[PDB]
Amino acid sequence: FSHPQMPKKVEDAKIAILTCPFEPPKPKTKHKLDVTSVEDYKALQKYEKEKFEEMIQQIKETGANLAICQWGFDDEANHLLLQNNLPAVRWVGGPEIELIAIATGGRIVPRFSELTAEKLGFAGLVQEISFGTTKDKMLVIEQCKNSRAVTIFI
Amino acid sequence: EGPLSVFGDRSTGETIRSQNVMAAASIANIVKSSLGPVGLDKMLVDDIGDVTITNDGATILKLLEVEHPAAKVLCELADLQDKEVGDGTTSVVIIAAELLKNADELVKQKIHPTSVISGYRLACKEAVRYINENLIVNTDELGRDCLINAAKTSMSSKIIGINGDFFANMVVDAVLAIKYTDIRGQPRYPVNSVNILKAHGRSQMESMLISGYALNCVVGSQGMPKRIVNAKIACLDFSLQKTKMKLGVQVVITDPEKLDQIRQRESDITKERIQKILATGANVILTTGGIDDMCLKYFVEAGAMAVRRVLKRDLKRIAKASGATILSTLANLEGEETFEAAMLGQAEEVVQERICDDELILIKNTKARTSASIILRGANDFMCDEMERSLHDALCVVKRVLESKSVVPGGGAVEAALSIYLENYATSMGSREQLAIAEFARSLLVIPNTLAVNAAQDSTDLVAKLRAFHNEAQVNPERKNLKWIGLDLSNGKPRDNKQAGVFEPTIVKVKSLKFATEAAITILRIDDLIKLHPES
Amino acid sequence: VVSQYSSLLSPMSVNAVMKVIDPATATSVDLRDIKIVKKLGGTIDDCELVEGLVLTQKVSNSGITRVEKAKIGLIQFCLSAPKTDMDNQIVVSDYAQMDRVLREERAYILNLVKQIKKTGCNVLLIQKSILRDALSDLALHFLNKMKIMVIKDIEREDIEFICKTIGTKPVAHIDQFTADMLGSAELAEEVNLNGSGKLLKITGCASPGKTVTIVVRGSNKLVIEEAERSIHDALCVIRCLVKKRALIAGGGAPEIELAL
Amino acid sequence: TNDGATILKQMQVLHPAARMLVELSKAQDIEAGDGTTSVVIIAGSLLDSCTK
Amino acid sequence: KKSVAMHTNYLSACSFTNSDMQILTASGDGTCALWDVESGQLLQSFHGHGADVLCLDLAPSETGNTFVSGGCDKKAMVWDMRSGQCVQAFETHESDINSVRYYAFASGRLYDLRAD
Amino acid sequence: QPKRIENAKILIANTGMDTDKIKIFGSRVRVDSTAKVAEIEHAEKEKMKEKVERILKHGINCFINRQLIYNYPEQLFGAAGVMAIEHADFAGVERLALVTGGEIASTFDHPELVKLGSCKLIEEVMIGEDKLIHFSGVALGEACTIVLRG
């Protein structure tokens, strides 16, 4: 879990898989946004804050209990996720994203606006596992409905 | 190597102590042949044929390559005396090495260095007190002649020595010109504000003292006049070039018709600035920055002199002397861009004079302040370079005399008097310090001995006669006039050096004793050396 | 090595330790409150104990080297052309915009300098600034024309020491620059050391709060280094005496008593 | 230099016992600031007795 | 110039960040370091990657938050400012990667972040 | 900022507080006059001041930020009479959260949804020749600092 203070165990988790970093939108093409007045600066700041709040609210509206991203995210999104009781994990690899989507029965959503309740995966238990005196942590997703993927932990 | 296990060499006891004395003595022996009027200059080759003919002690040690740390202490000691006094640089190195050499002899006799250091410190403190109480002559009783005599004394042993009759007047006049008073009413003489220009050519007699300032610069353009009678000098600290916008400003053209006007302003802005300066009547424009060709034409058409690339320190002296004001920018407190006549310096003449196939600017007779500059002529640059160093010493000597109005007799008079007094005073202080203080007195005799040796005369006999004269002075209350007896190297006999006009600033002898004692104490405090091998 | 100078250094060290602590309450001494400044030249006899603040920086002003009844003010922003943290450019499309930009930049600098001067400040310390010109030459010219001593390139690590010494609260935006932010002092003067360097000394402060500076001078580098080390040893000994109020005889007495 | 901590720090001692003595000098300087030579002399004498 | 010179060991590469506010440096011990140009403080040192780093690449589309470092560990591993963690790593390289070019990024083998 | 706080109200944060720029990295300031540039600079400073005011509205005595705190927020906190500790690394902020009970925050639009750490006294102490910040009378104390002298 990204934030150190989120709970280490989630039961009956409604999993939301996302591949959009929880950051303000960025066009792929070479883009320059011109600020020509103080009002433009205020509008841009409000746009940033509202983008963060809106993306978090969109994630929350689907009823998800746990969100998984692939490209990480920044401090404001992390604290909003913690504040709204939304445990989350970031920088999950592509193959791991595919495995989670297959096992939990949920789809992969490329942006928040396309996130619906029917695209949420389900897991009976999501847990963080310690490994003794090593500071290393690993996430465990299991107790799925009809999981078509398995993991052998040696 | 052994149980210590340190990757380097080590020396302890008399082995390192002798090396430190040997290293210190090596530096002194280099410059012992350049002391006194019968001293001789030295020639230094800089491994690429660069020749430096010099007699200054600091200059010799600056160019020398020294490896031993003890030698480096003496070499840096010469620099400290040069910076903080300006004269007596050769004396302090010789005295310090002699102090350390004699101190080691006591140490070899199982006298603890702490006792030797204690004796040296007491002797140095009492030597200064004795000098300030019995060997100082107030310059107010002598008038202008003491300054000339003090300047002439410093010029002896230098390449401008015999011509000192003509050179002393120029130095004294130069220093008196730049004199100014400050807060609390202390007349201070900012020596090194007298610009010194070197140019080979005519004999040394033809060296000129400019009643103004001399610039090592030429006019920007040939079309401009090379002489202004009533100069209105304007000093600027910015370049006069085509205007170019800063880093955060870009020119983006959407309507093509706006391109020509914008390019016009790149040159019209500077023209407006120049016209504002010219409109107030300025004749001479000196700037630290560059001037473009199209900017020079405005001065050409107006018949005004314009000098570019002026050194910043030169501009400050000209502005102060002429009463002008340095303007880093044209901007008033009202947000406009203006130039007022109040920032114009004035001079009685500005000439593009010619000096031996070259040319230079002479700002003659500036008003509201008197300045001075000296142009030195010689056979070649080697001769001219040494004249500047010798002249700098004479300028420093006159500065100390005018600030501190006390002088001391020269030619070893002070050292001979101190040796007699210190050796008598040693018997009334301590038991182990008696030898240390007495050895301090003997070490001071290295100066009169070195003067006599340089003249190929009987150093043993002359010092004995010189010491005998001073001995009678301290024991006979009616023979106190013998304190001024020093050395006359021309005839090789003792002579009253106060009557002979051989004077030195009191600060030169006092600072020499304090600095040499501390330098000698520092080396004497060592008894073990660890030299770590280079990491390469 | 400084044994003949002990009659001067020992009272200096005792005063330096006492000046930075409260004798009735202190249980430890922070030697970082005693700044040691090493300047070549002179003799160890010239070592001085400065009550105020000594800065090695050079005054950018020319002709203004002494200020009486100074009002020092720390500046943590830059006196240059405006430059936002974002990427900023000024686009020029007409000839009039050129001199409009020039005039507006001049007006902005003049407004900053006028705001600084209106508080009564006469000595200005400018924190060292990278990525932006701390002191533009035009701003320097305006500051000089208003008779304000300017010292720039102040190190970022000396801000706390300066504030503790002269009682100045640093200012990072021109809006908050007011009279109360200034640290009143009796004298701010730059003095040369017998033609061997220059030192800026601000001696005499209305709030001399537990801070002192020691200026160490000597003939050569090595003796200055050992003067500093020996002064530090004396300060450490007084610090030990502060920590543990107990004294014991020296000269090998404790070791012989211990052996017996 | 006469300071024990500076003397031991400047010279590049290689044997581990000498390195420990240098660190001991540093610790004594940190806690006290004086007696830096005395503590090293005491440690050396202690180990010399430990030999016998 | 910055001329900070706070470093115990030599600098294999001193890559100025795309954001004109801070620099990214990697010492000879294999640990990258981030410095603020204005303040001068070391924001955070990145552990791991025992052998010395040899190339530093910031994100190309500004985004001064992620970078990739490679050295003698035959590794291509990606960091993140906002967490100070190795978010992604690669194993294909087998010999002392000299220079790395950011496209995904090509190092000398073209890696793809979207598929590892 | 003050060097001693009694009955502290800790607020642990992980915000910028250092030339805080909008994460729209394609944005730039493009105007035709330096007056507009000065206005934009004042707007940026006003944004930072509003950020500091939002932080202060929590009603706190102390403020620990994981990242750096620049000079302007530093003087704002000093004028507010709030002790601000900067550059407390991830482990540092985690340990303070564990020992005081505070929540590591990154947005301050909801003061009532963020809990604040508490301790009896904060002061500066000398350990050898270094000065450290001491948290005394902590609330939870599920984080220890062991000092080793050798």
Ligand SMILES: Nc1ncnc2c1ncn2[C@@H]1O[C@H](COP(=O)(O)OP(=O)(O)O)[C@@H](O)[C@H]1O
């Ligand atoms: N006309 C003179 N007659 C006798 N002695 C002189 C005369 N001029 C100088 N001296 C002495 O010669 C000594 C050497 O001075 P010098 O070496 O030229 O100075 P520096 O040591 O700065 O080079 C001085 O101490 C001075 O007393």
Ligand SMILES: Nc1ncnc2c1ncn2[C@@H]1O[C@H](COP(=O)(O)OP(=O)(O)O)[C@@H](O)[C@H]1O
């Ligand atoms: N005037 C003195 N007379 C006798 N013993 C002294 C005197 N001054 C210092 N000592 C002794 O010399 C020892 C060494 O002190 P010092 O060299 O100053 O520092 P360190 O203890 O670090 O070597 C001390 O233990 C002290 O007892």
Ligand SMILES: [Mg+2]
């Ligand atoms: Mg001479």
Ligand SMILES: [Mg+2]
């Ligand atoms: Mg001691």
